[PDB]
Nucleic acid binder design. Structure first.
Ligand SMILES: [Mg+2]
Ligand SMILES: [Zn+2]
Lengths: 316, 515, 140
RNA sequence: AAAUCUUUCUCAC
RNA sequence: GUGAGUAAAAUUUGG
């Protein structure tokens, strides 16, 4: 009397007939699988060269340069940031800055590869400030050795458009670096390069929540010697710097797409592999179409550069 | 830095990707991929393998677990305004409650029995019928699954109807039971490491190990394959109804319904899809679509490829690979002898998500790492000290604390930086008990839980039936008067002993303090 | 009229599981919005203030772990630790005392924890969570 | 303006 | 700071 899982209802035949009348899949082709050796150093070099040729490099490091001191004291930094906000005509309201927009080009921003600064001693402070500002946007926020400014980006409508940001409002994060690029700003004898980054709230939270110091310490436990590298990520023993690796880590923290994780997983597979599929395993390193933007593109390029450097310096 | 590890490293030390991108494009791409597979030009979706060896569960009584049908997680509820169908995002609890209200059923088991014991599809069950239930259960909503490491471009996941969830729960429970019966590797109590160890034991005899992933797994699992498996294990009308709904499923993308005849929409039936392969052969250890097999000669490899093709398990040529000295499954990498491969492995970092919850999660991660031999204990102690320092840097400000007690962590205004050994041995101030992985939930965890309970999708004016007697079964029915009586009695009892809120109970502490 | 009627409209009786599922406020989820939520309205600050003078002076002071045996590295294996559930009489008494009934009921179920360990001793004894390397044994 | 269909709502007390 | 409406209101985002 108790209903069983295999119980047959009165509408069973009707539903089976309906399923029969409904469409069915066609048989797919059988694939021909060829097993070959994993890719060599040349394949990774070719991938990096293709990225470099297709996209090129920016003149400066942009926001990645914010990981180094700008050479200004706290008061000078605050003055420079506020005067940059005023110069760009950001609206002032309740003591805070707001960026107003009316129309959008609806075209992706130009994306190129960022060259590596020499080092990034302020990575921890930069990440902490990014975490703090996007939840406390509007005003200049300071740390021991640097400061930034998170400006909410809201639409311009008229007399009563919008006064406070909401859960989905984006932020323009503005930071300072040493002068010497096209982004220089001068005020009252104080000079500094101003670099900006447009982030939606989820990207800001993801970037700000990363623990740079602990990640670096954990990576160091079972790590081989890191070679000195150049501004472009190439092995430069004569004039390269090992500290650039820290910068690379910072870039991974700044990249909300975390494409370096995909590269790392594929490289783990590569290192563990005796044989892979012909022409298909290699395509796992072609991740340009999966991402978009200057920061993700640079992160992908430097992850591929790290794989190349590992294959060059410590062949496996 | 992950590239220069001496051992194996998956690069999980950072959080997964995220963004505010809409899920429209990913869902549309997945639906288009499924449609292309249906045409037979991209991947095989026709199941040819024989599943006669599977046992029949048709004689098992129809049993439903009520707890699995209620959750704070999201689901899609369908209503009719003026003829058009409206899909609303709600909680699975609210969706199931609405379904029971519409069908006038006191429990999901009553509803399923009524559905199975109607004379026709037009027969009315409450305010609806089986025909209308099947029509409404084929509607799915789409959302973005973010924070997936190794997926810079996020995938689309889907919210289903409560009726679909009910039938899916029944069939998935029975499929899991059949999987457990087929092989001891599919026992309920077996962690990823244990399953990897069993796989290492299974494949040690042969020379080459094929570590395989499938490409577009969910989009190549057709309703026909699900029906074949369900008939093989004897699900009858429940399986027929589920297959019918899957075949006719429609996905809401933005504001338009798009038909999706092919696929099963991202892991709707993991156990059934696994049985699709496990029921055809025995020389495969697979979970969802991650599988491992072993072979000696190219002829065995061709047999393996044919077996995979016949079961609609399309081998991923971009990830699958052959090894001789390593064994990878469930992201766990072992040696052929069963030992854990040296290196960080799948160790993941702990993001800053609260002064105290972050420390608890770091302690749990370090305990897992040290116990399995990933790193020595002193390294874990140093890392825990560093994490405490970083938390102090992030949180020791007036926004989070106004206290200066000595026993407090430096991140809450104190001057205490306990050692990992001191915490794990409970040789600490009781305030630190919540930081123990086995200790009670932290203050921030409870605050966030309450705030989440007060959200728009979960807020309710109902009177909470909390702090219940541990002898009253939950399957018992109750009215409003019953709720009032129980709540009044409990409040009077609490006032009869000098209390206003119940005391948090931790089983570990209680057992430790027992004489 | 009554919220019970609005919620379970058309039904005058519902199972206790269904009724309780509507008022769940103990499920925590790790999300990107943790910092913003904790900062908003000083909710975490107020919670810490309340805990330090209403909840902290109620936690029992449990003893620390002492027993430990010499261990050495070994092949990775799975350690099964069995935690028995509360007895019916103990649960009834604990409820009568005034402890949270939900938690007391949650401890009635017997639990099995599977953990990977890479250390062993001469007696093949089980170790506390996170302390297999040092060798703190359950001794149960 | 930028990591460019995103930077978003309404009503009563 | 309280509630209500919208294929959604941030525990968002499912198996
Ligand atoms: Mg796959
Ligand atoms: Zn510049």
């Amino acid at each position: 009397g108790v209903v069983k899982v295999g119980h047959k209802a009165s509408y069973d035949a009707e539903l089976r007939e309906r399923l029969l009348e409904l469409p069915h899949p066609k048989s797919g082709p059988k694939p021909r699988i060829e097993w070959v050796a994993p890719p060599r150093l040349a394949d990774i070099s070719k991938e990096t060269a293709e990225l470099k040729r297709q996209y090129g490099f920016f003149e400066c490091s942009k926001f990645l340069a914010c990981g180094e001191e700008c050479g200004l004291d706290q008061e000078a930094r605050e003055l420079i940031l506020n005067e940059y906000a005023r110069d760009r005509e950001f609206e002032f309201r309740n003591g805070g800055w707001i960026q107003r927009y009316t129309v959008a080009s609806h075209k992706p921003a130009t994306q190129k590869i960022l060259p590596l600064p020499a080092s990034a001693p302020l990575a921890r402070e930069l990440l902490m400030l990014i975490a703090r500002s996007t939840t406390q946007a509007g005003k200049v926020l300071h740390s021991d050795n640097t400061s930034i400014l998170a400006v909410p980006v809201m639409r311009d409508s008229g007399k009563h458009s919008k006064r406070r940001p909401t859960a989905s409002t984006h932020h323009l994060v503005v930071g300072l670096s040493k002068p010497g690029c096209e982004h220089d700003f001068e005020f009252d004898g104080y000079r500094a390069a101003v670099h900006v980054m447009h982030l939606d709230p989820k990207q800001s939270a993801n970037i700000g929540e990363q623990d740079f110091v602990s990640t670096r310490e954990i990576y160091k436990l079972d790590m081989l010697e890191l070679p000195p590298i150049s501004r472009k990520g190439d092995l430069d023993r004569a004039s390269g710097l090992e500290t650039r690796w820290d910068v690379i880590l910072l870039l991974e923290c700044l990249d909300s797409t975390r494409v370096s994780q995909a590269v790392a997983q594929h490289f783990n597979r590569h290192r563990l592999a005796l044989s892979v599929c012909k022409d298909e395993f290699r395509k796992g390193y072609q991740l340009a179409s999966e991402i978009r933007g200057t920061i993700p593109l640079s992160s992908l390029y430097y992850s591929l550069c790290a794989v190349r450097l590992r294959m060059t310096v410590h062949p496996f | 830095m992950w590239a220069f590890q001496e051992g194996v490293c998956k690069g999980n030390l950072l959080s997964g990707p995220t963004s505010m991108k809409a899920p429209d494009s990913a869902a549309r791409e997945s639906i288009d991929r499924a449609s292309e597979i249906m045409t037979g030009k991209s991947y095989n979706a026709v199941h040819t393998g024989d599943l006669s060896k599977l046992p029949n569960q048709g004689e098992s009584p129809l049993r439903i677990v009520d707890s699995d049908l209620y959750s704070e997680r999201s689901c899609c509820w369908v209503i009719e305004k003026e003829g058009r169908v409206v899909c609303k995002s709600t909680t699975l609890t609210r969706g199931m409650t609405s379904l029971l209200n519409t069908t006038k059923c006191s429990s999901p088991s009553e509803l399923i029995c009524k559905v199975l014991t109607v004379e026709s599809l037009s027969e009315k069950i409450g305010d609806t019928s089986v025909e209308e239930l099947l029509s409404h259960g084929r509607y799915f909503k789409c959302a973005l699954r973010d924070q997936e490491r190794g997926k810079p471009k996020s995938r689309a996941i889907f919210l289903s109807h409560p009726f679909f969830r009910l039938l899916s729960s029944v069939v998935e429970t029975h499929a899991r039971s059949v999987l457990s019966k087929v092989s001891a590797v599919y026992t309920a109590t077996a962690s990823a490491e244990q399953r990897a160890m069993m796989a290492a034991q299974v494949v040690e005899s042969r020379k080459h190990v094929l570590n395989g992933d499938c490409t577009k797994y969910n989009e190549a699992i057709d309703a026909d394959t699900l029906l074949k498996v369900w008939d093989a294990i004897g699900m009858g009308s429940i399986g027929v109804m589920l297959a019918y709904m899957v075949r006719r499923k429609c996905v809401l993308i933005k504001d338009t319904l798009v038909e999706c005849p092919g696929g099963m929409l991202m892991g709707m039936f993991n156990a059934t899809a696994t049985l699709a392969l496990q029921g055809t052969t025995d020389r495969f250890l697979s979970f969802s679509d991650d599988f491992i097999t072993s072979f000696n000669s190219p002829a065995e490899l061709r047999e393996i490829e044919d077996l995979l093709f016949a079961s609609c398990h399309n081998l991923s040529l971009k990830k699958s690979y052959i090894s001789v000295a390593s064994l990878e499954i469930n992201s766990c990498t072992l040696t052929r002898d069963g030992d854990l491969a040296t290196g960080l492995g799948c160790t993941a970092g702990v993001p800053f998500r609260g002064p105290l919850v972050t420390l608890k999660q770091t302690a749990a991660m370090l305990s897992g790492a040290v116990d399995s031999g990933v790193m020595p204990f002193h390294s874990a102690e140093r890392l825990f000290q560093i994490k405490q320092q970083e938390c102090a840097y992030r949180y020791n400000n007036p926004t989070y604390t106004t206290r200066n007690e000595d026993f407090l962590p430096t991140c809450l205004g104190g001057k205490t930086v306990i050692s990992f050994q001191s915490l794990l041995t409970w040789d600490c101030h009781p305030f630190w008990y919540q930081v123990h992985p086995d200790g009670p939930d932290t203050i921030d965890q409870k605050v966030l839980s309450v705030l989440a309970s007060k959200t728009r999708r979960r807020r309710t004016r109902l009177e909470a039936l909390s702090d219940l007697d541990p002898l009253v079964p939950h399957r018992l029915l109750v009215s409003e008067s019953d709720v009032s009586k129980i709540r009044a009695a409990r409040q009077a009892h609490l006032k009869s002993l000098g209390l206003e809120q119940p005391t948090n109970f931790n089983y570990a502490i209680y057992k430790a303090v027992q004489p | 009229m009554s919220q019970f009627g609005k919620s379970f409209k058309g039904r005058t009786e519902v199972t206790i599981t269904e009724y309780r599922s509507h008022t769940v406020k103990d499920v925590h989820r790790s999300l990107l919005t943790a910092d913003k939520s904790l900062r908003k309205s000083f909710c975490f600050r107020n919670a810490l203030n309340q805990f330090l003078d209403k909840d902290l002076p109620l936690l029992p002071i449990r003893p620390k772990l002492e027993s430990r045996v010499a261990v050495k590295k070994s092949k990775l294996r799975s350690q099964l630790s069995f935690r028995p559930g509360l007895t019916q009489e103990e649960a009834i008494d604990l409820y009568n005392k005034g402890y949270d009934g939900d938690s007391v009921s949650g401890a009635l179920q017997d639990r099995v924890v599977n953990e990977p360990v890479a250390y062993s001793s001469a007696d093949n004894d089980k170790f506390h969570r996170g302390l297999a390397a040092l060798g703190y044994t359950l001794a149960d």
